[PDB]
Point group: C3
Chain length 141, copies 3
């Protein structure tokens, strides 16, 4: 019942290394509950356990040779972040107004206090227009 | 144990706006159980709760500039459907006998009585040949 | 709590029909637990129930007309394997050092003793370099 759960949705990114995305966490379809805390661009894990994690980033053109989404874990004890999931695609067509999604999801054993973020190769290529096209979520199984 | 669950699989579409797909719900790998009801092209949600939803649509050529899958919620109180998930891809190669899947899945808070459907940009491009290539499912977490 | 769960990660494939992949099951992010048994290239299902299954295979070039991932079930009673999930994509660009992921995941009713494997169209195109790019997992819901 009360398992930690969040579904986060894209917003226009404020200008700022694969940079980390920041998210909507309460409006429209986005939510956090049962001690899941969306804070400082991280999803903060409240309970040690196995979680299913997921993200889609829709990229659209307007130059890149490829586009990448990486979902990363930062742990308090470890200096280095751990890459959990990576979706990387070479981009074929020139121009353009191409567009395409990269979707990733898998199960990972996480510790209370772990922080999850989504990093992208190029923030300016991320389609931020709609909550249904770019999103990031996690739930305790 | 007895959580609402369905996995639905593609069938040849009967001719008929992003049109909605209709599905196999009992033969081969397809099923509905624990009060999940596949009715009138909708998955009907029997219990309020958080659900993981998912679909893949394999598109194949034989003209389009892009292909789109949208998973949509219709609620009794709301006039307008809500787009939960969208996978949209520009199509690069001309001709052709190209083919490619769009996969989407995420967690949403749903109300008893909600109805879920999958809409596509072009029904004629949907590969309906095999239950393992185009599918649509949901489970209460 | 103690539901069968595994997340398996890619390794360099030892040379050997869509051939089956073999996996890391204990180092880095990979694990098996609660009676899930990774044995002889199969995930062996210890308990009858509904499982969410998933895989991504990142393919990279260095000739193919297409790339395919299939997740397959072998049952003791049945002679023939059952294809549960298939992601197949035509490959457009010539050369090359193209790369791209195919991700698939869905829910299936499995019997104790069932064995799950991931088959690919071309083992030599599978990117085996990183545990976050090619992976295969399953959990009892």
């Amino acid at each position: 019942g009360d398992k930690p759960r969040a579904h986060l949705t894209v917003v226009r990114q404020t200008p700022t290394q694969f940079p980390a995305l920041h998210w909507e966490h309460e409006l429209g379809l986005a939510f956090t509950k049962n001690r899941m805390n969306y804070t400082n661009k991280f999803l903060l894990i409240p309970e040690s356990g196995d979680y299913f994690i997921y993200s889609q980033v829709t990229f659209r053109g307007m130059k890149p040779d490829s586009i990448t989404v990486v979902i990363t874990k930062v742990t308090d004890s470890y200096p280095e972040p751990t890459q959990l999931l990576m979706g990387t695609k070479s981009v074929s067509e020139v121009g353009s107004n191409w567009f395409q999604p990269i979707y990733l999801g898998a199960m990972f054993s996480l510790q209370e206090g772990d922080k999850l973020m989504v990093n992208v190769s190029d923030i300016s290529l991320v389609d931020y227009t709609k909550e249904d096209k770019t999103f990031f979520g996690a739930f305790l199984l």
